[PDB]
Design a protein around this ligand. Structure first.
Ligand code: UPG
Ligand SMILES: *[C@@H]1O[C@H](CO)[C@@H](O)[C@H](O[C@H]2OC[C@@H](O)[C@H](O)[C@H]2O)[C@H]1O
Ligand code: MN
Lengths: 299, 35
């Protein structure tokens, strides 16, 4: 029986003396591991991106949760945030001016763009990986999310859920002003509300093998599109994918809202009461809750 | 991190150094779009 590997990756940095983050990670990992089911030859690989102090914190938490109740094989891998930052920087430098808080190009921001260049960072043996926030609660077997890779149309490289607040309606204001008729920043079903980065299916092989995706990483393409859209942000990879998704929606397999049900309502109380519902609406059986902007998750 | 700029113009972070005007979403007023 040849072993089949499944890969997840989570950012876990600055966790020491950060009780809220540790508590979120505990909720995420315990739910993940409690509900996961994998066949005997299968192995779940949990990648964490951490500096040395958070690595120690993560190990302490994981030993409390491993082995998993279901008894399948699980491997834990740590990646040094400082190593990854240096590998990322050449590729990611040009976009940081547009999508980082705030100005200009700082190493401390580079790691927020890991997903955009994940295909260049992870070993070649890894064809696919799902990057996950740690402020999630899983309501189903994570094995099921991997079948969404099967639904990628030719040319799609990344699976991602839409953003459930009007943050991009706000961000694309100028472009929306100059293009009254645009779908850019509008709510579903026919608008493009942008993406949320909490759950991302990164098909590393498809990303590597796409001429289009590779071009979009080039500094002049980043600049051209940022200029076209009058677009600035501070949410890192989320903003980049959101922007290239306006120009090239074919690159993205849009996940159903139930795979990343975002709970943050910050934008409702900051000017978008009228339209907020059209963005936030999600119905169906929820598979993953996402407590973004420090929003408590219900039970 | 920074707090999102509540204004429609200027940088993505509130109190962007290179910004002077603040245009608020409809229904809101102030230098931070409060009332
Ligand atoms: O001190 C920290 C803060 C965050 N994280 C990790 O980063 C993820 C994202 O941060 P989170 O607190 O979950 O923030 P959200 O409100 O879900 O995310 C928004 O804000 C993030 C930080 O600016 C951006 O990267 C995202 O694209 C944007 O959607 C977390 O889940 C963790 O995996 C850490 O490891 N250490
Ligand atoms: C604007 O600033 C506020 C306060 O810092 C943040 O809470 C907002 O981010 C939230 O809404 C957009 C979602 O994509 C984020 O995941 C969430 O934290 C930010 O847009
Ligand atoms: Mn989150």
């Amino acid at each position: 029986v040849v072993p089949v590997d499944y890969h997840l990756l989570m950012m876990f940095t600055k966790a020491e003396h950060n009780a809220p983050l540790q508590a979120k990670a505990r909720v995420a990992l315990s739910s993940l591991l409690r509900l996961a089911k994998f066949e005997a030859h299968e192995v779940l690989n949990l990648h964490f991106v951490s500096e040395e102090a958070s690595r120690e914190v993560a190990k302490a938490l994981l030993r409390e949760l491993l082995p998993p109740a279901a008894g399948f094989k699980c491997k834990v891998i740590f990646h040094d945030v400082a190593v990854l930052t240096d590998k990322l920087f050449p590729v990611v430098e040009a976009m940081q001016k547009y999508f980082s808080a705030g100005s200009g190009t700082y190493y401390s921001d580079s790691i927020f763009f890991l997903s955009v260049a994940m295909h260049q960072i992870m070993p070649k043996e890894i064809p696919r990986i799902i990057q996950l926030d740690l402020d999630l609660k899983y309501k189903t077997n994570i094995r099921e999310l991997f079948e969404e890779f099967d639904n990628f149309l030719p040319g799609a490289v990344i699976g991602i859920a839409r953003e459930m607040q009007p943050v991009y309606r706000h961000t694309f204001w100028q472009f929306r002003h100059e293009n009254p008729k645009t779908r850019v920043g509008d709510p579903p079903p026919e608008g493009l509300p942008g993406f949320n980065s909490g759950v991302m299916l990164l098909n590393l092989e498809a990303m590597r093998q796409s001429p289009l995706y590779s071009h979009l990483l080039e500094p002049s393409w980043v600049q051209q599109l940022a200029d076209k859209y009058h677009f600035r942000g501070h949410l890192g990879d989320q903003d980049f994918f959101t922007m290239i998704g306006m120009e090239h929606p074919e690159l993205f397999h849009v996940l159903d809202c139930t795979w990343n049900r975002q709970l943050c309502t910050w934008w409702r109380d900051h000017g978008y009461s009228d339209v907020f519902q059209a963005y936030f609406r999600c119905e169906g059986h929820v598979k993953i809750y996402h407590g973004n902007c420090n929003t408590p998750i219900p039970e | 991190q920074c707090e999102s700029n509540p204004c429609l113009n200027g940088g993505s972070c509130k109190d962007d150094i290179n910004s002077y005007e603040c245009w608020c979403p409809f229904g809101f007023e102030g230098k931070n779009c409060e009332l």
